[PDB]
Write an enzyme that holds these catalytic residues in place. Structure first.
Site, PDB file in Angstrom:
ATOM      1  N   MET A   1       0.866  -1.204   0.000  1.00  0.00           N
ATOM      2  CA  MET A   1       0.000   0.000   0.000  1.00  0.00           C
ATOM      3  C   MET A   1       0.870   1.211   0.000  1.00  0.00           C
ATOM      4  SD  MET A   1      -3.641  -1.014   1.623  1.00  0.00           S
ATOM      5  CE  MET A   1      -3.188  -0.609   3.329  1.00  0.00           C
TER       6      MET A   1
ATOM      7  N   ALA B   1       4.096   3.904   0.831  1.00  0.00           N
ATOM      8  CA  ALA B   1       4.758   4.344   2.087  1.00  0.00           C
ATOM      9  C   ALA B   1       5.828   3.337   2.486  1.00  0.00           C
ATOM     10  CB  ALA B   1       3.715   4.542   3.242  1.00  0.00           C
ATOM     11  N   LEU B   2       6.730   3.085   1.547  1.00  0.00           N
ATOM     12  CA  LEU B   2       7.608   1.934   1.646  1.00  0.00           C
ATOM     13  C   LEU B   2       8.717   2.219   2.646  1.00  0.00           C
ATOM     14  CD1 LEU B   2       8.055   1.010  -2.068  1.00  0.00           C
ATOM     15  CD2 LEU B   2       6.327   0.192  -0.501  1.00  0.00           C
ATOM     16  N   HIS B   3       9.036   1.208   3.404  1.00  0.00           N
ATOM     17  CA  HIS B   3      10.144   1.300   4.363  1.00  0.00           C
ATOM     18  C   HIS B   3      11.047   0.065   4.199  1.00  0.00           C
ATOM     19  CE1 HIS B   3       6.724  -0.781   6.567  1.00  0.00           C
ATOM     20  NE2 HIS B   3       7.672  -1.685   6.408  1.00  0.00           N
TER      21      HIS B   3
ATOM     22  N   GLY C   1      11.296  -2.704   5.652  1.00  0.00           N
ATOM     23  CA  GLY C   1      10.557  -3.962   5.684  1.00  0.00           C
ATOM     24  C   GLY C   1      10.040  -4.349   4.274  1.00  0.00           C
ATOM     25  N   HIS C   2       9.451  -3.369   3.564  1.00  0.00           N
ATOM     26  CA  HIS C   2       9.115  -3.603   2.134  1.00  0.00           C
ATOM     27  C   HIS C   2      10.344  -3.924   1.293  1.00  0.00           C
ATOM     28  CE1 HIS C   2       5.777  -0.820   3.414  1.00  0.00           C
ATOM     29  NE2 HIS C   2       5.056  -1.820   2.926  1.00  0.00           N
TER      30      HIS C   2
ATOM     31  N   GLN D   1     -10.517  -2.395   2.049  1.00  0.00           N
ATOM     32  CA  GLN D   1     -10.097  -2.942   3.345  1.00  0.00           C
ATOM     33  C   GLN D   1     -10.111  -1.882   4.475  1.00  0.00           C
ATOM     34  OE1 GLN D   1      -6.100  -4.050   1.450  1.00  0.00           O
ATOM     35  NE2 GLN D   1      -5.320  -3.415   3.582  1.00  0.00           N
TER      36      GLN D   1
ATOM     37  N   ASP E   1       8.911   9.239  -2.782  1.00  0.00           N
ATOM     38  CA  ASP E   1       9.907   8.464  -2.057  1.00  0.00           C
ATOM     39  C   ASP E   1       9.757   7.000  -2.463  1.00  0.00           C
ATOM     40  OD1 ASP E   1      10.720  10.722  -0.581  1.00  0.00           O
ATOM     41  OD2 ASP E   1       9.414  10.158   1.153  1.00  0.00           O
ATOM     42  N   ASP E   2       8.514   6.510  -2.670  1.00  0.00           N
ATOM     43  CA  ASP E   2       8.335   5.070  -2.971  1.00  0.00           C
ATOM     44  C   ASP E   2       9.007   4.691  -4.292  1.00  0.00           C
ATOM     45  OD1 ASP E   2       6.662   4.939  -0.654  1.00  0.00           O
ATOM     46  OD2 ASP E   2       4.812   4.826  -1.939  1.00  0.00           O
TER      47      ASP E   2
ATOM     48  N   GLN F   1      12.863   4.715  -3.965  1.00  0.00           N
ATOM     49  CA  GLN F   1      13.395   3.523  -3.343  1.00  0.00           C
ATOM     50  C   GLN F   1      13.396   2.343  -4.328  1.00  0.00           C
ATOM     51  OE1 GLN F   1      12.437   2.949   0.943  1.00  0.00           O
ATOM     52  NE2 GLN F   1      11.037   4.655   0.601  1.00  0.00           N
TER      53      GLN F   1
ATOM     54  N   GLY G   1       5.196  -9.724   4.316  1.00  0.00           N
ATOM     55  CA  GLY G   1       5.932  -9.715   5.588  1.00  0.00           C
ATOM     56  C   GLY G   1       5.198 -10.642   6.593  1.00  0.00           C
TER      57      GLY G   1
ATOM     58  N   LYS H   1       4.952  -9.638   9.595  1.00  0.00           N
ATOM     59  CA  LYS H   1       4.436  -8.709  10.584  1.00  0.00           C
ATOM     60  C   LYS H   1       2.920  -8.716  10.678  1.00  0.00           C
ATOM     61  CE  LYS H   1       4.176  -4.249  12.168  1.00  0.00           C
ATOM     62  NZ  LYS H   1       2.712  -4.339  12.173  1.00  0.00           N
ATOM     63  N   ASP H   2       2.235  -8.760   9.523  1.00  0.00           N
ATOM     64  CA  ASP H   2       0.784  -8.930   9.605  1.00  0.00           C
ATOM     65  C   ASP H   2       0.528 -10.421   9.419  1.00  0.00           C
ATOM     66  OD1 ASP H   2      -0.481  -6.040   9.610  1.00  0.00           O
ATOM     67  OD2 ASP H   2       1.329  -5.957   8.352  1.00  0.00           O
TER      68      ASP H   2
ATOM     69  N   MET I   1       9.234  -2.751  11.909  1.00  0.00           N
ATOM     70  CA  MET I   1       9.007  -1.691  10.907  1.00  0.00           C
ATOM     71  C   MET I   1       7.494  -1.580  10.597  1.00  0.00           C
ATOM     72  SD  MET I   1      11.835  -0.410  10.137  1.00  0.00           S
ATOM     73  CE  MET I   1      13.710  -0.607  10.034  1.00  0.00           C
ATOM     74  N   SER I   2       7.005  -0.345  10.492  1.00  0.00           N
ATOM     75  CA  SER I   2       5.624  -0.140  10.099  1.00  0.00           C
ATOM     76  C   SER I   2       5.438   1.264   9.537  1.00  0.00           C
ATOM     77  CB  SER I   2       4.729  -0.232  11.335  1.00  0.00           C
ATOM     78  OG  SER I   2       3.392   0.091  11.012  1.00  0.00           O
ATOM     79  N   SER I   3       4.532   1.385   8.557  1.00  0.00           N
ATOM     80  CA  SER I   3       4.173   2.687   7.996  1.00  0.00           C
ATOM     81  C   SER I   3       3.594   3.558   9.090  1.00  0.00           C
ATOM     82  CB  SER I   3       3.110   2.513   6.896  1.00  0.00           C
ATOM     83  OG  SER I   3       2.056   1.633   7.290  1.00  0.00           O
ATOM     84  N   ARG I   4       3.076   2.899  10.110  1.00  0.00           N
ATOM     85  CA  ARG I   4       2.459   3.611  11.208  1.00  0.00           C
ATOM     86  C   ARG I   4       3.391   4.144  12.342  1.00  0.00           C
ATOM     87  NH1 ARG I   4      -3.573   1.356  11.378  1.00  0.00           N
ATOM     88  NH2 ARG I   4      -2.817  -0.304  12.789  1.00  0.00           N
TER      89      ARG I   4
HETATM   90  C1  LIG Z   1       9.980  -7.899   6.149  1.00  0.00           C
HETATM   91  O1  LIG Z   1       9.611  -6.881   7.066  1.00  0.00           O
HETATM   92  C2  LIG Z   1       8.449  -6.216   6.971  1.00  0.00           C
HETATM   93  C3  LIG Z   1       8.069  -5.592   8.164  1.00  0.00           C
HETATM   94  C4  LIG Z   1       6.905  -4.849   8.168  1.00  0.00           C
HETATM   95  C5  LIG Z   1       6.130  -4.760   7.013  1.00  0.00           C
HETATM   96  C6  LIG Z   1       6.496  -5.325   5.839  1.00  0.00           C
HETATM   97  C7  LIG Z   1       7.679  -6.037   5.776  1.00  0.00           C
HETATM   98  C8  LIG Z   1       5.528  -4.986   4.921  1.00  0.00           C
HETATM   99  C9  LIG Z   1       4.588  -4.241   5.542  1.00  0.00           C
HETATM  100  C10 LIG Z   1       3.414  -3.729   5.033  1.00  0.00           C
HETATM  101  O2  LIG Z   1       2.635  -3.041   5.697  1.00  0.00           O
HETATM  102  N1  LIG Z   1       3.049  -4.205   3.837  1.00  0.00           N
HETATM  103  S1  LIG Z   1       1.619  -3.683   3.033  1.00  0.00           S
HETATM  104  O3  LIG Z   1       1.863  -2.322   2.462  1.00  0.00           O
HETATM  105  O4  LIG Z   1       1.395  -4.632   1.858  1.00  0.00           O
HETATM  106  C11 LIG Z   1       0.272  -3.969   4.132  1.00  0.00           C
HETATM  107  N2  LIG Z   1      -0.091  -5.214   4.443  1.00  0.00           N
HETATM  108  N3  LIG Z   1      -1.129  -5.284   5.373  1.00  0.00           N
HETATM  109  C12 LIG Z   1      -1.599  -4.092   5.780  1.00  0.00           C
HETATM  110  N4  LIG Z   1      -2.607  -3.960   6.675  1.00  0.00           N
HETATM  111  C13 LIG Z   1      -2.922  -2.752   7.197  1.00  0.00           C
HETATM  112  C14 LIG Z   1      -4.088  -2.838   8.191  1.00  0.00           C
HETATM  113  O5  LIG Z   1      -2.353  -1.674   6.946  1.00  0.00           O
HETATM  114  S2  LIG Z   1      -0.707  -2.878   5.011  1.00  0.00           S
HETATM  115  N5  LIG Z   1       4.945  -4.147   6.817  1.00  0.00           N
HETATM  116  C15 LIG Z   1       4.245  -3.490   7.974  1.00  0.00           C
HETATM  117  C16 LIG Z   1       3.580  -2.139   8.035  1.00  0.00           C
HETATM  118  O6  LIG Z   1       3.851  -1.342   7.201  1.00  0.00           O
HETATM  119  O7  LIG Z   1       2.926  -1.912   9.112  1.00  0.00           O
END
Ligand SMILES: COc1ccc2c(c1)cc(C(=O)NS(=O)(=O)c1nnc(NC(C)=O)s1)n2CC(=O)O
Ligand SMILES: COc1ccc2c(c1)cc(C(=O)NS(=O)(=O)c1nnc(NC(C)=O)s1)n2CC(=O)O
Ligand SMILES: COc1ccc2c(c1)cc(C(=O)NS(=O)(=O)c1nnc(NC(C)=O)s1)n2CC(=O)O
EC number: 6.3.2.1
Lengths: 274, 286
Positions: B37, B39-41, B43-44, B69, B85-86, B89, B155, B157-158, B192-195
């Site tokens: 979605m 806002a890449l960091h 973790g992406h 969603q 920025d996305d 990267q 990831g 993470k979710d 790591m999180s966009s949040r």
């Molecule tokens: C390998 O290390 C990681 C660590 C954290 C990661 C990722 C990779 C990728 C994400 C991430 O959010 N990916 S996303 O843009 O496809 C989303 N997947 N599920 C989402 N659910 C919500 C509720 O935002 S957003 N995220 C977490 C995040 O952005 O919160």
């Protein structure tokens, strides 16, 4: 690992989803176009019309699936006589190894018409059709126009989920007097069978009345249904070709359903207004 | 469409990326999808790196803030958007395709046919947001059909989302391998999180309690499940301004089976208005 054995020009039967998937992939790589005809067995001339439609595409290999969805020797003999090369006959367990879990939820059209008294019926159909499409990965998939609401819902599934298959609707095969072919026709006693010709007669009368507009088409079909004893009509509706509201003129579809004794029958027809 | 190898190619139209993907696949490249979605960091970027490592890969990263969603509210409007920025990267990482569709191109008929997840979608994150995971699985199915990747990367993470995606793939016989990539963490352990950008200095200090709680539990677990849970609870309780939403230890599939030897410990907590999630593998007695 090895592609399962496929003998060109003969009927090959597979019950494992991975096996037909592997053969279908291998055939497509060979220069065949894979055509899917999904069925629930007990095949009739309407099914054969789907098969014949599929076979005539140059380069086709025809996959006929036979799966009774909870949500034989004769069948295979008919497919062999049609020159079909693949029958896919999975078990309920092979289709649903984890039971019922992720499913498809149709759009609001599924709640209308046939979906009236039981709003989850098309979810079952669309779920299995999606699974058959992903297993077989056909270039084209062939259905009869008999269950027209179903057919529109499948076109919606394909559009909505961005599926890479063409959906081909084949005109409904009918008995000599017009009655649409159906597994249910054999349950009609002779008085019911004679009355049942009113469904098709109503719709054809309407399709011809329609030069005089929509009301005349509906009124002609209702009068024909009204001339038949023991035909309890559940609905009679004129819609556009996508089953939305009928446009003031232009193309539509006229759909009927009725109960004769314990047997529910459906029919539909193309209508052009004015 | 044009495809320039070794440069970042951006496609908005689903038909463009679908044709490019098919053409590359037919010439021998394996297509890897990383759905995001935006806002890449970092973790992406780890997802992208896992995808690039696959021999002969072409990497397609999708960026689409999926309205289906979000439940709310201004949640959708509030989601961070940083597309400059996305794309920068992605260029730095050598990604050759970004797929950035419009909402109209994804949902030209609005919400119509949808994916209905199994019962796991009503638990945990899905309890108060009963349609959230139908929105996620519907979009992920569509991206899979548009791109037709060999492998798709998510990831851990979710984690609940990842398990649901595996269910989608199994249940609809999808021909794609799902690869889960371990959560990338900041130096202190914060996932790591966009949040994380919505944490002020005090809340960012406090937020280390989630990962500290989870690792403490994973080590405590030699003494059993109650000890692991109580260790995590103790850390969360020692932390200023952390409001725990849930802390639950489940079987790895999060399904209708009791915990055996392998578990996942999941936490959700609020720091002010920011809801943070984290999870870890737990081995009981072991
Ligand atoms: C390998 O290390 C990681 C660590 C954290 C990661 C990722 C990779 C990728 C994400 C991430 O959010 N990916 S996303 O843009 O496809 C989303 N997947 N599920 C989402 N659910 C919500 C509720 O935002 S957003 N995220 C977490 C995040 O952005 O919160
Ligand atoms: C080209 O001409 C025709 C005419 C009638 C047809 C067919 C084709 C195909 C069928 C048919 O029903 N085939 S089926 O059992 O595999 C089904 N397909 N969809 C079905 N939907 C439900 C809800 O049962 S049942 N039927 C109707 C029938 O067999 O009852
Ligand atoms: C014996 O000579 C030929 C050669 C090619 C044929 C055919 C016959 C028949 C077809 C074919 O398209 N058959 S079909 O039943 O799949 C269709 N009929 N209409 C279709 N598409 C629409 C939009 O109505 S598909 N096709 C392939 C084609 O027309 O694309």
């Amino acid at each position: 690992m090895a592609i399962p054995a496929f003998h060109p020009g003969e009927l090959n039967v597979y019950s494992a989803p991975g096996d037909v998937a592997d053969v279908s992939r291998a055939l497509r790589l060979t220069g065949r176009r894979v055509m899917l005809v999904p069925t629930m067995g007990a095949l009739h001339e309407g099914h054969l019309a789907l098969v014949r439609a599929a076979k005539r595409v140059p380069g086709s290999v025809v996959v006929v699936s036979i799966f009774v969805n909870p949500m034989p020797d004769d069948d295979l003999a008919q497919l062999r006589a049609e020159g079909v090369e693949i029958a896919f006959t999975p078990t309920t367990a092979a289709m649903y190894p984890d039971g019922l879990r992720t499913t498809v939820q149709p759009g609001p059209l599924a709640a209308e018409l046939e979906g009236g008294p039981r709003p989850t019926h098309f979810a079952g159909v669309l779920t299995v059709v999606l699974k058959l499409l992903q297993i077989v990965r056909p270039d084209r998939v062939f259905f009869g126009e008999k269950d027209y609401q179903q057919l529109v819902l499948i076109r919606q599934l394909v559009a909505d989920f961005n599926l890479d298959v063409a959906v081909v609707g084949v005109p409904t095969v009918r008995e000599a007097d017009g009655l649409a072919m159906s597994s249910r026709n054999r349950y009609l006693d002779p008085a019911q069978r004679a009355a049942a010709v009113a469904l098709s007669a109503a719709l054809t009368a309407a399709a011809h009345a329609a030069t005089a507009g929509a009301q005349a088409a509906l009124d002609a079909a209702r009068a024909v249904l009204d001339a038949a004893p023991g035909v309890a009509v559940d609905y009679l509706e004129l819609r556009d070709i996508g089953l939305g509201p009928m446009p003031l003129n232009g193309s539509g579809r006229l759909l009927v359903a009725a109960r004769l004794g314990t047997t529910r029958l459906l029919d539909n027809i193309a209508i052009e207004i004015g």
